[PDB]
């Protein structure tokens, strides 16, 4: 199955290109190659600091006629700093302006944690912790529903919301629109079994980010495990004659998740796409599921003491 | 959901109206009432022999501009006797003339076991066993695929096919169209766990039939079980204040199977549609799934010796 049906009836492609860490000059050729390769799903976000450059690529392919706008699935996110109702719309409008679009297929609240409104993405205080916003999660969803009603975003989702937080959006009195997706970190070390199960039971679509363990994350330490270099998984890639990266993408796909591997390497963007012609066995699925360490790659450490920090619960 | 997504773009209505056993003297009002109520999916077959009286109901509500052909999802199936590659094309046409439709949304090969061409639906040899045709299943699949190129049917599929029979069509050399749906028997007594997951893995939608156990089946014996009377199932219903039949239709929808209950009674047709306003619990589901006793209502016993009789394989 190449696409998942969402709540709004939209068909969301099961595989997308990640743009976090993709430098400005490199993201353009990368979005282009992706599209040429077959990727019709692209993952953006304001804090990634390259949406503008990503947009130039999509514009070039539409001009070149390789794609019609209704063939791509553009996703973006609301940074924790524009959580305050009156700031939401304006932020959506900047993402659209940069990407050079009329509407976003899906717009997500980037984190359950809202930050102090300001120029800087991470308004740190005197102890290295984030200066929290006053904002409550509900008004924000309410601010997000207004975008759908205005026809600026086809769908609205959540990202990094634990099952408790998810639940409250679901029970908010007078709810108009239901979370379409909940993009969460997921790979062999963070299998997210319970949360995936909850989201799916509530009809929400789960999108796995950092599928390859995010080798390039700024804070990586040369002592942490490395999924691309885990011998046990090289073992499985052997039997399929695919790369670990290909087996690390098939994995969430077979669990029914959208996967969004990142890469600015033309050769790799293609390698990551050839994953529709093979199947990890049931035991392969079972094997990779046992590799769980509850090991997070993106844990937003500066917000461990924020009222809405998502990761203190079991899920 | 309320409409599923097929491997061709289509979205198939989650609930349909069955028409096996509905006498022609009542199938027309049956369909008409169903449409009014809100059904946009009717399940038909040539062997049901009321395909003409169904067409009338369609034709009538279409002219009253109550619904558009664009909105309906009419389904029919190829009788065992037209398995010969030459007969397919015309058998389909016969269906379109009866139903008075210019194309079908989903046409299924009723059974994996074709019989000898003739005016009889069940050509019984001396011993009451039925006479088969030396036809080749992929070849029939070939004729089905041409209905799609021809523009006659929007999608094609299979019914009563085990995993080995399906898999042989998935590997067919130069396969143009792939099984959109697999209509199989499914209810608490025959839960269909292995096949159902085999299928959903292939991106093949499943359609459960005889969802209420088929109490009207000609071959019912007093000793046989009664899903609707089952006091255990009655308890789940009781809890949700809904009724057994409603519980039983909800059952497949929470497993991602479209379900097609049959009824020629306008009161039950309305009732059976009122199943989107409640939810069976994780336990209710576990409860209902454990009732399975590998009990089948449709076993095509006259074909147990047919080269292709589907029910010898585990799944
Ligand atoms: N909503 C959120 O809160 C959230 C959080 C985190 C991430 N995300 C989304 O998820 C995306 C994916 O996560 P991620 O960027 O952290 O990391 P990732 O995709 O797991 O890993 C990216 C790294 O893997 C390399 N790589 C990619 N394909 C490869 C291949 N076939 N062989 C070898 N190396 C390969 C990349 O190299 P090159 O780039 O050099 O090719 C890059 O160093 C993000 O970009 C973002 O769009 C969303
Ligand atoms: N592909 C295949 O091989 C295949 C095989 C069998 C069936 N099917 C399809 O699946 C459909 C459903 O299966 P089925 O006909 O075997 O039987 P079913 O749907 O399990 O049950 C039909 C019986 O249930 C009764 N009923 C319906 N709604 C009811 C309600 N709310 N309360 C109480 N009784 C209710 C009907 O009575 P009234 O009509 O008198 O109300 C009838 O006696 C078929 O009609 C056909 O379209 C496909
Ligand atoms: N440590 C974290 O959890 C986040 C992860 C995260 N990446 C991502 O895609 N979403 C994020 O919020 C991110 C992105 C940045 F541009 C800067 C920091 C940053 O840290
Ligand atoms: N015993 C069986 O398996 C089938 C079931 C079946 N009902 C059904 O919907 N599809 C079938 O083929 C059926 C329908 C008939 F009109 C006549 C006989 C008949 O027997």
**Major sheet of chain A: size, sense and barrel closure?**
8 strands, parallel
| Intertermini distance of chain A | 28 Å
Looking at CATH, the homologous superfamily of chain A is: NADP-dependent oxidoreductase domain
CATH class of chain A: Alpha Beta
CATH topology of chain A: TIM Barrel
CATH architecture label name of chain A: Alpha-Beta Barrel
Largest interface: A-B, 11 and 10 residues
Order of helices and strands of chain A: EEEHEHEHEHEHEHEHHEHH
Q: How much helix is in the residues of chain A?
A: 25-40%
Q: Please tally the helical runs of chain A, counting DSSP H or I stretches of 4 or more residues.
A: 10
| Oligomer designation | homodimer
Please tell me the total number of domains of chain A: 1
Protein name (chains A, B): Aldo-keto reductase family 1 member B1
Binding site for substrate (chains A, B): 110
Binding site for NADP(+) (chains A, B): 9-18, 210-272
EC number (chains A, B): 1.1.1.21, 1.1.1.300, 1.1.1.372, 1.1.1.54
């Amino acid at each position: 199955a190449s696409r998942l049906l969402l709540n709004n009836g939209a068909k969301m492609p099961i595989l997308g290109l990640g743009t976090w860490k993709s430098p400005p000059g490199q993201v353009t050729e990368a979005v282009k190659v992706a599209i040429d390769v077959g990727y019709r799903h692209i993952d953006c976000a304001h804090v990634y600091q390259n949406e503008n450059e990503v947009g130039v690529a999509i514009q070039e392919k539409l001009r070149e006629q390789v794609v019609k706008r209704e063939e791509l699935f553009i996703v973006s996110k609301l940074w924790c700093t524009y959580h305050e109702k009156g700031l939401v719309k304006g932020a959506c409008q900047k993402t659209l302006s940069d990407l050079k679009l009329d509407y976003l297929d899906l717009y997500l609240i980037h984190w359950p944690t809202g930050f102090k409104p300001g120029k800087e993405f991470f308004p740190l205080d005197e102890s290295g912790n984030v200066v929290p916003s006053d904002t409550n999660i509900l008004d924000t969803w309410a601010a997000m529903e207004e975008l759908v009603d205005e026809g600026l975003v086809k769908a609205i989702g959540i990202s990094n919301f634990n099952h408790l937080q998810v639940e409250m959006i679901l029970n908010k009195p007078g709810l108009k629109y239901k979370p379409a997706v909940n993009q969460i970190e997921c790979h062999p070390y963070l299998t997210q079994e319970k949360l995936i199960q909850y989201c799916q039971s509530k009809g929400i679509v789960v999108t796995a980010y950092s599928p390859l363990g995010s080798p390039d994350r700024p804070w990586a330490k040369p002592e942490d495990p490395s999924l691309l270099e885990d011998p046990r998984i090289k073992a499985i890639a052997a039997k399929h004659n695919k790369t670990t990266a290909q087996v690390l993408i098939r994995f969430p796909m077979q669990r029914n998740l959208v996967v969004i591997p990142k890469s600015v390497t033309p050769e790799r963007i293609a390698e990551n796409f050839k994953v529709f012609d093979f199947e990890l066995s049931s035991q392969d699925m079972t094997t990779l599921l046992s590799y769980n360490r509850n090991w997070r790659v993106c844990a937003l450490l500066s917000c461990t003491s924020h009222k809405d920090y998502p990761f203190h619960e079991e899920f």
